[PDB]
Enzyme design. Sequence first.
Site, PDB file in Angstrom:
ATOM      1  CD  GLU A 143      -8.923  -3.437   3.157  1.00  0.00           C
ATOM      2  OE1 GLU A 143      -8.337  -3.651   2.070  1.00  0.00           O
ATOM      3  OE2 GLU A 143      -8.576  -3.968   4.219  1.00  0.00           O
ATOM      4  CG  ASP A 186      -1.836  -1.063   1.421  1.00  0.00           C
ATOM      5  OD1 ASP A 186      -1.876  -2.017   0.604  1.00  0.00           O
ATOM      6  OD2 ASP A 186      -2.593  -0.988   2.424  1.00  0.00           O
TER       7      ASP A 186
END
Length: 448
Positions: free
Chosen positions: A319, A62
Amino acid sequence: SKDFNNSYGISHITRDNMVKIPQQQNSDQFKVPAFDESTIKNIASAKGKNASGNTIDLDVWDSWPLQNADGTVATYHGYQIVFALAGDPKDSNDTSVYLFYKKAGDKSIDSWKNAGRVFKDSDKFVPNDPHLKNQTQEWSGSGTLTKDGKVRLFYTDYSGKQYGKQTLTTAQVNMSQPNDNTLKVDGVEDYKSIFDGDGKIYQTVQQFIDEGGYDTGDNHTLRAPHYIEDNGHKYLVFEANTGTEDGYQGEDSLYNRAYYGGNNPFFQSEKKKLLEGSNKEKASLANGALGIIELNDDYTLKKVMKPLITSNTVTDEIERANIFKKDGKWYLFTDSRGSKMTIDGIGQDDVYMLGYVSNTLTGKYKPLNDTGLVLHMDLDPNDKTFTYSHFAVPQTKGDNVVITSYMTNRGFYEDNHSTFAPSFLVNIDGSKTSVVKDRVLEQGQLTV
Ligand SMILES: [Ca+2]
Ligand SMILES: [Mg+2]
Ligand SMILES: [Mg+2]
């Protein structure tokens, strides 16, 4: 339990919309582009040392760019900066924020240098703080370049020892330039927890512990803080779950028309289906939210606000909260996996980015492309060109956003580590979006 309808004054990702995604998703409009497998490289500069002092080639997953307040990519002293989670592929609990940087003009993945970790291990113990001393991993967030030229980081304090507690956290990152092609992390300051949930608006870890913790199948989240500004106010928008007073998890949530949408016949059949099938328990527990808090100008909490949107009954896990202004409207995005959803026809490999639009920051969010579908990635987790954590990066000019993501699952391949996926482009126009078919960008490219 009786049928009712309570929106709690917030928006909802509804079953009637989600059930249409299976038949809608197999279109070039939404499909994450097929990527050129043979040319994918690791981030050459993604190297770190471990406790034994050995250099490791890292997994890098990420990632988020340093942004101007409006969401566009900042230029910091001639560089673009990307914060990313990274660690040893062999240790799934080894997760730290690293700071990568590239000269504004450069484009290739090879031009990304590594300033190393934002934090030393000892840093968490310095401030007078109720949570930081318990941190075990550093999870994702956002980064803003302040009007005074400061690098201001937001990230998630995850504590494996406190039952997976997650705390929105911030620090200023002090930077210097020892020569023409190097940015150095000098250290950090103003390092502090901001918010770890209240119980009434957002679920706390204590609620998770009290209900019985992991054995329950509940999934407590409080993470991925994304910084925005709106006309003199500063906010973080983040993944969370509802609290007791804004539509909590529970069997009673299955009777709330607000979460189903459509009309009575659909609500009656879908409710019955849910109650009679093996999705009942997961749907009951599902209360994901994109939360919002206002901050003071010293980045402390100012006001806990009602969520922008929830996924009650649908999933516990929306998310990578992301939000920016475009064409006078606020666009709200989230990533979500089919494996955690309770929708017929959505399966284990399906991964999405969902999107919504509102005239005001806290107003009604309506779905993009009728169902809320923006992106669909269904590659098996073993696929080398598997991508995840898709993120929409607004641009200075034009109607396209750049989509960044990471490529290749953590620890799946000896030589092919999690890396920056080739970036691509999505057109946004009103309530419609479309993947731009005939363009692919460099791995990790942020701007066009
Ligand atoms: Ca839940
Ligand atoms: Mg293609
Ligand atoms: Mg607190």
